[PDB]
Structures are given as C-alpha cells and as structure tokens.
Amino acid sequence: SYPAIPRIYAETTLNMLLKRAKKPRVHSIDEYLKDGGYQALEKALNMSPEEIIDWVDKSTLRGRGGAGFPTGKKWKFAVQNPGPRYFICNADESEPGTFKDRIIIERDPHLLIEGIIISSYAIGANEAYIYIRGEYPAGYYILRDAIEEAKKKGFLGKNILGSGFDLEIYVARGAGAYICGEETALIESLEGKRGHPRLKPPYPVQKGLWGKPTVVNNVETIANVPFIISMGWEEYRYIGPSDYAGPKLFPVSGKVKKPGVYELPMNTTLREVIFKYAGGTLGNKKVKAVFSGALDCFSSEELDIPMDYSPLGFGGTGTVIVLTEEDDIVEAALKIAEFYEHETCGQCTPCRVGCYEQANLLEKIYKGEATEQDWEGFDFVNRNIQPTSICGLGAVAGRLIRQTLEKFPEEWEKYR
Amino acid sequence: EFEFPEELKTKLQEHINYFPKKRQAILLCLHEIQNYYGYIPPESLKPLADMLELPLNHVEGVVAFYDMFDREDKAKYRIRVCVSIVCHLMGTNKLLKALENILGIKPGEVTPDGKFKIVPVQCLSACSEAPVFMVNDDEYKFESEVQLNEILSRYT
Ligand SMILES: Cc1cc2nc3c(=O)[nH]c(=O)nc-3n(C[C@H](O)[C@H](O)[C@H](O)COP(=O)(O)O)c2cc1C
Ligand code: SF4
Ligand code: FES
Ligand code: NA
C-alpha cells in the first residue's frame, strides 16, 4: 500500500516510455519481466562499458532535464577522469507544469532502475543515487520496493549476473526546494547540506559528489537507455526526426480538454500537441499563450513550431501550459514571479533581491497600487536578476515575464 | 532532558545506517521526526545532530533551508495547497474557499484542535490534475466542496 496519487491521463503514439506507464498503476518486477524487462541489462553486461557509451552517443539521446546536453558525450567526459565515479538519477521534478518524470517512477519503476544499472555500468559507478523531491512520497516508497525486487532477482548487489559488477542504488529525498534540481545543489543536498549551487567550473563530471566524477541525468533521459540497448542505436535513431530522434514525454496542462502526459516524436508541432492530441481547448476558446513551464511564453501566432530542442523549436522540457483568451497574462506573470521569489537560494545578490522585487512590484502593478517609480523599477529589476548569478535560476527568472511584456503589450498597458 | 522515543530512535538509526555516510541521512531523519510529532520540535535538533555526528548549527541551517520542515506549528494533517501557475488558472481559490467553509482556516493557519494546517506550496507537479493538494503524503485533484469534504472525512 502506497499514498494516494492523482490519476494523470497518459497517451502514447510510440508505445515505448509509456508502454506500461499509460496504465495508472504500479507495474511490479513480474509484469516488467514478462515484457522483456532487464534483458537489455543482460545484453549490456555482455558489452564493454566503452561500447554502451558509444551506442548511447550514436542514439543522439540528449538530456531531458532542460539543458539538452548529449548524454553519451556527458558519459565520455566523466570516464576521462579516474574513479570512483557516481551516478545520480535526478527525480527532483518541481518546475511549474512539469509532471512527466513522476509517471515513469510511479508506474514503471523498473524501466528507470534498469536504465540506472546500465548507465552506472557504462561509467563504472558502483554507487548510484535517486534524488526524489520530498513532495513525491509515493514515488519514494514505490522506488524503495522496486529496488528490493531488483535485488532479489539479482539485478543489484555484488557481482550482478556473474559480471563482476557491483551496484547499490540509494534513494534520497528532497525537502521543499526547487533549487535542489540544479545538479550541483542536488549534490550538496546529497552530502547532507543546504541545497546551494556550486560555482561552475568544476562541473560534476569532473568533481561532483565528494569531489569525485559524477554523472547526473534526468529520469526521462535514463528511461531511454533500456530502449537504446534493446533496439540498438540505429533502430532507436529511426524514431521521429533524425536530428531530434527518440520518444519524448510532453506534460500538457491548463485549458485543454485532455490534460496529461503524451509520448510523441519531436517533429510534432505545438498546435498538434494541443489540438490533435490534447483534444483542443476547454469550451473551444481561443489559445492566448503557451507557457513552457516557468521558462518561455509562446503567443497564439507561434503554435506551428516543432516540439524539439532546435533554436526555433519549443525547447525546454516540452512542458505545455495552455492559457486561453479569458486568462489574464499579468495575473499569470505574477504567478511565475511568485515561483522565482519562493525558489531563489539567495547566494547571489541580483538573484536574491531581483526575484523578491520582481514579485513584490508585480503584485503592486496587478493590484493597481504601483507608482510610476514602481513601474520603472519593475522593468529594471526584471532585466537585472541575471548579473553575477552562479546557476541557471538567476539567468531565467525574468525570461518568461519579459516575453509577456514583449508579446502582450496591450494587456500590460491596461495595468498602467 | 529531550529523548527520542525508542520506536522513532530505531527508524532514525535505520536512515543513519542506510547511506555510506551518516550525514547524508539528515533529510530522511527530519521527515521522520516531522511525521512522528506533526512538526520539528526545536529540542529534537540537538539529539539528531549528535546521531548524525554534525554540529547543532549545521542541523538548524538545514531545517531553516528546507521548506517542508515546520518548527512552529504542530498539525496532525498538513494540507499542502498548490498556489502555482496551473492550479491558479484551474481553481486554487475555489479549493481555498472550500477549505475555509469546511475547516474554518486560511493558509498558514491551524484548526483549534491541532488537527489540520493549510500550507501554501509551489508546483506539486500533478498540473494536469489542477487544482492540486496533499493531505500529509496523500495527493488529490480538487473537484468541489462536496468531494473535498468526503476526502477530509478520511483523516480522523
Ligand atoms: C534551478 C534549476 C532546477 C532544475 N531542476 C531540475 C529537475 O527538477 N530535474 C532535472 O532532471 N534537472 C533539473 N535541472 C537541470 C539539472 O541541473 C541538470 O541539467 C540535469 O539533471 C542533467 O540531466 P540530463 O542531462 O539528463 O538532462 C535544473 C536546473 C536548474 C538550473
Ligand atoms: S542564481 Fe539564484 S538560485 Fe542560482 S545560486 Fe545564485 S542566488 Fe541561488
Ligand atoms: S501548478 Fe499546481 S501542481 Fe503544478
Ligand atoms: Na526538492
């Protein structure tokens, strides 16, 4: 028995990452094995670590955590440095609108565990971690049980399947900070400290957990690793566009008929995600904007863009929050400002004071209590959260809000 | 003078022995303490620091940093209400109004019996099921006051 989880709708056109996770229930090891589960691990243990890295590289798989670094290349960088090495599964998923990772953790934990074992073997890590946000208690108990199921079927522990490879997967819990998804802050939290990002360089692949070479990968990235080994890199590269190949999970929310997670190729357009798959809008109202998580804002004129990591593409993590004609953009921008205000770790002064002031002044603007000085101050602060910042949060805290100012000036001017 | 009840001490020692290094268990221990008492008693920090082999200052800093931990209000059930973008768009205010009609409390408040506390939180990452809330570890989609009332009646 696990804590209650809402039943998120999940649909797939590829039947890969959502093969089992399209069903809202825990798929235990017996059901997993019946589908050919852990057979990719068996094949991997018969291959050299260098060969697995090459396949993952040739698959063109890129990070699903937001930065899109090529996964195979990240592994090459880490194995350049001497051991012991560490493998970390980033299950901190806390960005507004993003709920793709949890459905893998909660419904197909073994797809994630298998991915972790293959990845750990590829980089020579004998100790792996799952760092899962504190607000996923069910996901935590499901992973602990699944790890024990894997241990009993001999997929974990010492000398896994007579290969001489040892691995233990430890599950760590977060405790309320979005910043703990930042790979260096996650490592600090795993070391039993406050989740404060470290100045980069050094990068985790060189000096991470206990100053040792550390590979941090997102849940969704790791969930592709069993498919790459099972299918082979070539067959995997055939899925979707050849330049942005493989399956991709799209968490869709807001004013859509069918909100949920969609497994689609990355040549799908934003308009197709909304209208062809998510069933269009609630009450057939006009789409006003799409928020790419708390990162970007796309207008109704930008829906024909592809859902890939190209510069003109959707980018981010494929997070789709739909706002229709009746949704106030200034009220929406305030919710984004409030997010960054609550999440800055405060190490950097323009980030600490800029995230606070952007939200404080925007609330004044929204409530009709802003002076002309507050209006000018708001514009200044929004353009000045980034200076001296040592992590991605300070660099993006004003991005989406700046885009609503540029794309919806008529709406903002109504608040003047 | 402060002592952890044996049943808690045992669970705490298990977390401390779980990771390769003792100090890595700090967050698991603090979740355990809060689940046992319904908050983090200020007096529990010194015995925990000793067990983790960390200075009291380090533990206090960690408790202050992580938002899930509450050192002030003892509450049997924590009602975490998402106040972020998607739940806002889909009905956070309807959820809060329903909670006030049922329990008589607003965000940050605790009922007179110490049973329920409304905690406003950022995105719980169940956005397709907005407006979202948790009741301790259980997570739900808010539908209506009638539906919410039935959910809350399960926490006695
Ligand atoms: C403020 C901030 C929050 C982040 N949150 C997450 C998160 O919840 N999950 C995640 O996997 N990556 C998150 N990232 C990105 C990670 O730092 C990192 O790029 C990623 O985990 C690497 O894995 P990938 O290459 O598989 O994408 C965040 C980054 C920043 C700057
Ligand atoms: S940029 Fe912001 S969130 Fe990142 S380390 Fe600096 S203060 Fe913390
Ligand atoms: S915005 Fe409420 S759960 Fe994501
Ligand atoms: Na966290």
Residue numbers in the entry:
A (entry chain B): 3 to 418
B (entry chain A): 5 to 160
Give the article text.
Complex I couples the transfer of two electrons from NADH to ubiquinone (Q) with the translocation of four protons across the membrane. The L-shaped complex is structured into a peripheral arm that protrudes into the aqueous milieu and catalyzes electron transfer with one FMN and 8–10 iron–sulfur ([Fe–S]) clusters, and a membrane arm embedded in the lipid bilayer that mediates proton translocation. We have determined structures of the electron-input module of complex I from the hyperthermophilic bacterium Aquifex aeolicus, encompassing subunits NuoE and NuoF that contain the FMN cofactor, the [4Fe–4S] cluster N3, and the [2Fe–2S] cluster N1a, respectively, both in the air-oxidized and dithionite-reduced states at resolutions up to 1.8 Å. Here, we show that the redox state of N1a regulates NADH oxidation in complex I by inducing a conformational change close to the NADH-binding site.
We therefore sought to lock the peptide bond in place by exchanging a nearby residue, G129E, with serine and aspartate, respectively. The longer side chains were intended to occupy the position of the bound water molecule that has to make way for the flipping peptide bond according to our structures. Structures of the oxidized G129SE and G129DE variants were refined to 2.4 and 1.9 Å resolution, respectively. Overall, there were no significant changes from the original NuoEF, with the notable exception of the peptide bond of E95F that pointed away from FMN in the oxidized state of both variants, as was the case only in the reduced structures of the original protein. No electron density for ordered water was observed between position 129E and the fixed peptide bond in the variant as determined with NuoEF. The 3.5 Å distance between Oγ of S129E and the carbonyl oxygen of E95F is longer than the 3.2 Å from the carboxylate oxygen of D129E to this position. Thus, while both mutations fixed the position of the peptide bond, the Gly/Asp exchange seemed to exert a much stronger effect than the Gly/Ser mutation.
